[PDB]
Design a protein around this motif. Structure first.
Motif, PDB file in Angstrom:
ATOM      1  N   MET A 178     -24.052 -16.473 -58.346  1.00  0.00           N
ATOM      2  CA  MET A 178     -23.601 -16.820 -56.999  1.00  0.00           C
ATOM      3  C   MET A 178     -22.290 -16.071 -56.842  1.00  0.00           C
ATOM      4  N   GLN A 221     -19.964 -18.859 -48.585  1.00  0.00           N
ATOM      5  CA  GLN A 221     -20.632 -19.251 -49.832  1.00  0.00           C
ATOM      6  C   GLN A 221     -19.577 -18.763 -50.809  1.00  0.00           C
ATOM      7  N   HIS A 222     -18.624 -19.638 -51.092  1.00  0.00           N
ATOM      8  CA  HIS A 222     -17.465 -19.322 -51.931  1.00  0.00           C
ATOM      9  C   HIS A 222     -17.572 -19.347 -53.461  1.00  0.00           C
ATOM     10  N   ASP A 223     -18.699 -19.814 -54.003  1.00  0.00           N
ATOM     11  CA  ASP A 223     -18.889 -19.882 -55.454  1.00  0.00           C
ATOM     12  C   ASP A 223     -18.830 -18.531 -56.158  1.00  0.00           C
ATOM     13  N   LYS A 224     -18.231 -18.516 -57.352  1.00  0.00           N
ATOM     14  CA  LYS A 224     -18.149 -17.323 -58.198  1.00  0.00           C
ATOM     15  C   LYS A 224     -18.699 -17.894 -59.506  1.00  0.00           C
ATOM     16  N   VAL A 225     -20.019 -17.904 -59.598  1.00  0.00           N
ATOM     17  CA  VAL A 225     -20.700 -18.505 -60.734  1.00  0.00           C
ATOM     18  C   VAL A 225     -21.792 -17.645 -61.368  1.00  0.00           C
ATOM     19  N   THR A 239     -17.565 -19.838 -64.565  1.00  0.00           N
ATOM     20  CA  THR A 239     -17.067 -20.226 -63.247  1.00  0.00           C
ATOM     21  C   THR A 239     -15.555 -20.134 -63.257  1.00  0.00           C
ATOM     22  N   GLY A 240     -14.918 -20.416 -62.121  1.00  0.00           N
ATOM     23  CA  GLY A 240     -13.469 -20.323 -62.039  1.00  0.00           C
ATOM     24  C   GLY A 240     -13.038 -19.749 -60.701  1.00  0.00           C
ATOM     25  N   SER A 241     -11.849 -19.153 -60.640  1.00  0.00           N
ATOM     26  CA  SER A 241     -11.379 -18.577 -59.383  1.00  0.00           C
ATOM     27  C   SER A 241     -11.821 -17.123 -59.231  1.00  0.00           C
ATOM     28  N   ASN A 300     -13.275 -13.731 -58.582  1.00  0.00           N
ATOM     29  CA  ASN A 300     -14.311 -13.146 -57.718  1.00  0.00           C
ATOM     30  C   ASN A 300     -14.761 -11.887 -58.432  1.00  0.00           C
ATOM     31  N   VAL A 316     -13.727 -19.242 -66.764  1.00  0.00           N
ATOM     32  CA  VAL A 316     -14.109 -20.005 -67.934  1.00  0.00           C
ATOM     33  C   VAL A 316     -15.600 -19.848 -68.176  1.00  0.00           C
ATOM     34  N   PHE A 329     -25.970 -26.926 -62.238  1.00  0.00           N
ATOM     35  CA  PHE A 329     -25.493 -25.750 -61.532  1.00  0.00           C
ATOM     36  C   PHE A 329     -26.670 -24.976 -60.968  1.00  0.00           C
ATOM     37  N   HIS A 370     -27.757 -26.154 -57.715  1.00  0.00           N
ATOM     38  CA  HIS A 370     -26.763 -25.674 -56.743  1.00  0.00           C
ATOM     39  C   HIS A 370     -27.115 -24.232 -56.377  1.00  0.00           C
ATOM     40  N   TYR A 375     -19.832 -30.431 -56.017  1.00  0.00           N
ATOM     41  CA  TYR A 375     -20.008 -29.300 -55.112  1.00  0.00           C
ATOM     42  C   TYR A 375     -19.628 -29.613 -53.674  1.00  0.00           C
ATOM     43  N   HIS A 412      -4.345 -16.514 -57.052  1.00  0.00           N
ATOM     44  CA  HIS A 412      -5.640 -17.085 -56.673  1.00  0.00           C
ATOM     45  C   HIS A 412      -6.203 -18.312 -57.404  1.00  0.00           C
ATOM     46  N   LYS A 414      -7.086 -22.022 -58.715  1.00  0.00           N
ATOM     47  CA  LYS A 414      -7.236 -23.343 -58.100  1.00  0.00           C
ATOM     48  C   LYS A 414      -7.445 -24.190 -59.355  1.00  0.00           C
ATOM     49  N   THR A 433     -11.045 -26.852 -62.615  1.00  0.00           N
ATOM     50  CA  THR A 433     -11.011 -25.471 -62.139  1.00  0.00           C
ATOM     51  C   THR A 433     -12.315 -25.174 -61.427  1.00  0.00           C
ATOM     52  N   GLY A 434     -12.455 -23.964 -60.887  1.00  0.00           N
ATOM     53  CA  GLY A 434     -13.665 -23.610 -60.162  1.00  0.00           C
ATOM     54  C   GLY A 434     -13.338 -22.768 -58.941  1.00  0.00           C
ATOM     55  N   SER A 435     -14.211 -22.774 -57.935  1.00  0.00           N
ATOM     56  CA  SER A 435     -13.952 -21.989 -56.732  1.00  0.00           C
ATOM     57  C   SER A 435     -13.159 -22.786 -55.699  1.00  0.00           C
ATOM     58  N   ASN A 464     -17.373 -25.074 -46.797  1.00  0.00           N
ATOM     59  CA  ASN A 464     -17.836 -24.037 -47.709  1.00  0.00           C
ATOM     60  C   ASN A 464     -18.708 -24.537 -48.842  1.00  0.00           C
ATOM     61  N   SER A 465     -19.446 -23.612 -49.446  1.00  0.00           N
ATOM     62  CA  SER A 465     -20.212 -23.961 -50.628  1.00  0.00           C
ATOM     63  C   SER A 465     -19.184 -23.678 -51.722  1.00  0.00           C
ATOM     64  N   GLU A 466     -18.971 -24.662 -52.592  1.00  0.00           N
ATOM     65  CA  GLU A 466     -18.003 -24.548 -53.679  1.00  0.00           C
ATOM     66  C   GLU A 466     -18.486 -25.346 -54.860  1.00  0.00           C
ATOM     67  N   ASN A 467     -17.810 -25.145 -55.985  1.00  0.00           N
ATOM     68  CA  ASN A 467     -18.086 -25.914 -57.180  1.00  0.00           C
ATOM     69  C   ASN A 467     -16.730 -26.201 -57.803  1.00  0.00           C
TER      70      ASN A 467
END
Lengths: 152, 152
Positions: free
Chosen positions: A32, A92-96, A106-108, A110, A124, A136, A139, B8, B93, B95, B106-108, B119-122
């Protein structure tokens, strides 16, 4: 069995860790992404496909119309990797990256150049936690299911 | 002892999980944020301080000049919570919320309204992993050390 690794940007450890997760995939990768542009990440994903790994990706639509985004999307589709854009969310902000149905990155972070070399970020990789990964996956599946194919 | 939880957005579980991490702090909270605006998050952080929790926060400078950002920053400083803005990176950046020196969220998920409801987030909370948290702490400390106090 479960363990966690972390890497940071602009230090360099985040990028390497993310590459380590992709490079470790033996069977599957469910990704994602918001901004999808880092050449290094794309090369690694296609190397995974060539290894036989089942790779599928769903990315944010509105935030991926820039030239670099198109180059990566074209590069990825040309390799036979199923890819979709999703616009059902303002972002769709997820970076997974879900690897082999048991590992989750996952994490911040991009999947961009700025994320690897300029911004402060953290990535991480949570290894061998099947329950976390299947959650996940649900998701990932929900976002993929409402995406639009991007092919070549 | 170590365990991991995930939530999420826009489902609602991410927001609640992030609040759960802040609400769980008995001794400390070391937070890193890009967009810093969610009223619910601010109320929870100040409730932690009132509980006696040692709360310190470093946020991105350039991305926090909007009205909502200022309201939260003012609200936070007025409570005696040490806060700093950091502009040494094109974008700070991260979070991240480090709780009691052993837990890491942590995550997006950005600490904003859009992150909670649109937003879609985790968001993940990695509980009781001292080594992971001390590593994240070094990351937090480095960014804090080059920040500028924002006081009241």
């Amino acid at each position: 069995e479960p363990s966690v690794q972390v890497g940071y940007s602009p230090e360099g450890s985040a990028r390497v860790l993310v590459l380590s997760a992709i490079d470790s995939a033996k069977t599957s990768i469910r990704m994602m992404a918001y901004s999808f542009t880092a050449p290094d990440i794309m090369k690694a994903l296609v190397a995974a496909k060539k290894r036989g790994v089942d790779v599928k990706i769903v990315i944010d639509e509105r935030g991926n119309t820039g030239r670099a985004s198109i180059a990566a999307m074209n590069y990825i589709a040309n390799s036979g990797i199923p890819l979709r854009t999703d616009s059902n969310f303002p972002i769709q902000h997820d970076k997974v990256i879900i690897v082999d149905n048991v590992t989750v990155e996952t994490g911040s972070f991009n999947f961009t150049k700025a994320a690897e070399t300029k911004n402060s970020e953290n990535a991480v990789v949570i290894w061998n936690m099947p329950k976390l990964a299947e959650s996940f996956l649900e998701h990932w599946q929900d976002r993929w299911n409402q995406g639009r194919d991007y092919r070549s």
